Amino acid sequence: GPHMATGQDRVVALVDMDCFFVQVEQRQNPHLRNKPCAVVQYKSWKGGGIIAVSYEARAFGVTRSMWADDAKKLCPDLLLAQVRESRGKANLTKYREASVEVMEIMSRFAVIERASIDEAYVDLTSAVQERLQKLQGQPISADLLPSTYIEGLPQGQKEGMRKQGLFQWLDSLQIDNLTSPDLQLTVGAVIVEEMRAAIERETGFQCSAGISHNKVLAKLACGLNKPNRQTLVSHGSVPQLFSQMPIRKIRSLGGKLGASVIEILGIEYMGELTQFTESQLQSHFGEKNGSWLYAMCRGIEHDPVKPRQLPKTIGCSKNFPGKTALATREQVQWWLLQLAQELEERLTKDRNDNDRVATQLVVSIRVQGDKRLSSLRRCCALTRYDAHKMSHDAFTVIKNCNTSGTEWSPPLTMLFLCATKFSAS
DNA sequence: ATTATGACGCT
């Protein structure tokens, strides 16, 4: 009772740039804005692969990871912006730079963990205490939360409903108690409205956000009301929200572990998990996963927001699918060179931007017909930011995989170079 | 013939 810690000590947000690549291309090309439009990589095979989709196009069924010619079938007015191609591969530089813009604005407000190019976690705890003392008890006005939904409200015109829910939340709010977690979440949400306002002012990019007490609930919240909205998930709203939440919808339960939770325990929704003891869950899924599940189905998660605004690794990857698979030594070497050349460019930019040098080069390949996405990963030393050296060492490291008697076999379907193990430089 | 990443766990 009085000693069940409820995982309410932190205020955490998850910020997702709505269909980020599409937004970057729509800022750059106004003819695309407020239209069904998607971003593609390549264009020869079935029109190319769609990797990001505006919400107008999503309304037509257009999804990521779908061929452009198919998407056009669903949406004949679909507009398509193409990923830049450099040295024969996709070059994502435009979106890395756009993402750094956004991240740097976010970092003015709180400490941010870059989880991916288009999404960051925010630890708001300090910032909320700062803002709560700045208040000295004044009540929080709805006007401070113009895009915020309160999940589970109203209880008992979509914008009209949002305002009803917000009004119920704010009316029930105890602004005097500077230690109520619901007040802290609310101030976090006010700060997240300011953050998202600043991001849009200063970049033109819109985003959704989730505000709760930990990363998993923040992520889940963020997905509830998109685009261009934010959602506060209170500790108290967890039982109802989880009561019909498919297990697969929680971060990290979307794959094989979530499928085994569903199958072994005979359950469908997150909240069903609360019926099992911690020991039971640990027995089915291991000590770490069991403890994490026991806490997380009660809305409790301790994974911290790591203060890391920069990527930990710099990577260059190309699949060679179907008959494009690499089958000669010359091919493998030329593509290892193209990858090492992009890698060198980005690594030099990184060293100058962020004062660090990588020290380990990871080389990963896939051989044709291998079930695994990585047939082999081998690391070697990364001593100089030199494309020819890196590509030659990558070869040196993989060449024992060729089973011919100048020809390469089984032909390679993937090449991948990753600089890792950064040290301050 | 969903890519190109990127993070993290396990052993």
User: What is the distance in angstroms measured between the alpha-carbon CA of A116 and the sugar C1' of B5?
Assistant: 9
User: What is the distance in angstroms measured between the alpha-carbon CA of A106 and the sugar C1' of B6?
Assistant: 20
Our CA dihedral for A21, A22, A27, A33, rounded to 10 degrees, sits at -170
CATH topology of domain A12-18+94-239: Alpha-Beta Plaits (3.30.70)
CATH topology of domain A240-298: DNA polymerase; domain 1 (1.10.150)
Report CA torsion sign: A198, A201, A205, A211.
positive
- Nearest-CA residue relative to C1' of B9: A288
φ/ψ of residue A189, rounded to 5? -70, -35
From the alpha carbon of A420, which nucleotide's C1' atom is closest?
B6
CA distances from A262 to A248, A254, A259, A270, A301 (A): 9, 11, 5, 10, 20
In window 357-396 of A, residues with CB < 7 A from nucleic chain B are none
User: What is the distance in angstroms measured between the alpha-carbon CA of A16 and the sugar C1' of B8?
Assistant: 20
User: What is the distance in angstroms measured between the alpha-carbon CA of A84 and the sugar C1' of B8?
Assistant: 29
Q: Say how far apart CA A87 and CA A409 lie, in whole Å.
A: 24
From the alpha carbon of A311, which nucleotide's C1' atom is closest?
B6
| Helix H or strand E encompassing A360 | strand A360-367
Report CA torsion sign: A268, A221, A117, A51.
positive
DSSP letter assigned to residue A26: H
Sheet of strand A119-123: strand arrangement? A111-116, A119-123, A12-17, A207-212, A230-232, A148-150
DSSP letter assigned to residue A52: E
Q: Say how far apart CA A287 and CA A281 lie, in whole Å.
A: 8
Owner of token pair 């950064």 = A422
From the alpha carbon of A117, which nucleotide's C1' atom is closest?
B6
Contacts 24+ apart (CB under 8 A), A301-305: A301/A7, A301/A214, A301/A215, A301/A216, A301/A217, A302/A7, A302/A214, A303/A214, A303/A215, A303/A216, A304/A123, A305/A10, A305/A12, A305/A111, A305/A112, A305/A113, A305/A121, A305/A122, A305/A123, A305/A215
Does residue A312 lie within 7 Å of nucleic acid chain B, judged by its CB? yes
For the domain covering A314-424, report its CATH number. Answer: 3.30.1490.100
The answer to whether A220 touches A121, Cβ cutoff 8 Å, is: no
Nearest CA among A310, A110, A118 for reference residue A211:
A110
Which parts of A5-81 fold into alpha helices (H)? 20-28, 55-58, 68-74
Does residue A311 lie within 7 Å of nucleic acid chain B, judged by its CB? yes
Q: Say how far apart CA A376 and CA A378 lie, in whole Å.
A: 7
Nearest CA among A279, A283, A214, A285 for reference residue A251:
A214
Does residue A349 lie within 7 Å of nucleic acid chain B, judged by its CB? no
- Supply A274's token pair: 């609360």
User: What is the distance in angstroms measured between the alpha-carbon CA of A115 and the sugar C1' of B7?
Assistant: 7
Q: Say how far apart CA A93 and CA A112 lie, in whole Å.
A: 21
φ/ψ of residue A34, rounded to 5? 55, 45
The answer to whether A336 touches A414, Cβ cutoff 8 Å, is: no
For the domain covering A20-93, report its CATH number. Answer: 3.40.1170.60
Domain ranges for chain A, please list them.
Answer: 12-18+94-239, 20-93, 240-298, 314-424
Resolution in A for the shown PDB structure? 2.2
* Cα R_g (chain A), whole angstroms: 24
The answer to whether A110 touches A124, Cβ cutoff 8 Å, is: yes
Experimental method: X-ray
Nearest CA among A57, A11, A14, A51 for reference residue A32:
A57
Does residue A246 lie within 7 Å of nucleic acid chain B, judged by its CB? no
CA distances from A413 to A67, A242, A361, A373 (A): 19, 41, 20, 9
Which parts of A251-286 fold into alpha helices (H)? 256-265, 278-285
Please report, in range form, the residues annotated as the binding site of A. Answer: 16-17, 64, 118-119
Q: Which nucleotides of chain B have an atom under 7 angstroms from any protein CB?
A: 1-10
User: What is the distance in angstroms measured between the alpha-carbon CA of A34 and the sugar C1' of B5?
Assistant: 27
| Position A379, amino acid | C
Exposed (0-12), middle (13-18) or buried (19+): which is A362, by Cβ within 10 Å?
buried
CA distances from A177 to A197, A211, A217 (A): 28, 20, 24
User: End-to-end distance of chain A based on CA atoms, in angstroms?
Assistant: 51
DSSP string over A169-188: HHHT--SS-TT-HHHHHHHH
Task: Give Cα A216 distance to the centre of its chain.
Answer: 12
DSSP string over A198-230: HHHHHH---EEEEEESSHHHHHHHHHHS-SS-E
Return left, alpha or beta for A78; rule: phi > 0 is left, psi -120 to 50 is alpha, else beta. Answer: beta
User: What is the distance in angstroms measured between the alpha-carbon CA of A262 and the sugar C1' of B5?
Assistant: 29
In window 26-55 of A, residues with CB < 7 A from nucleic chain B are 41-42, 44-45, 49, 51
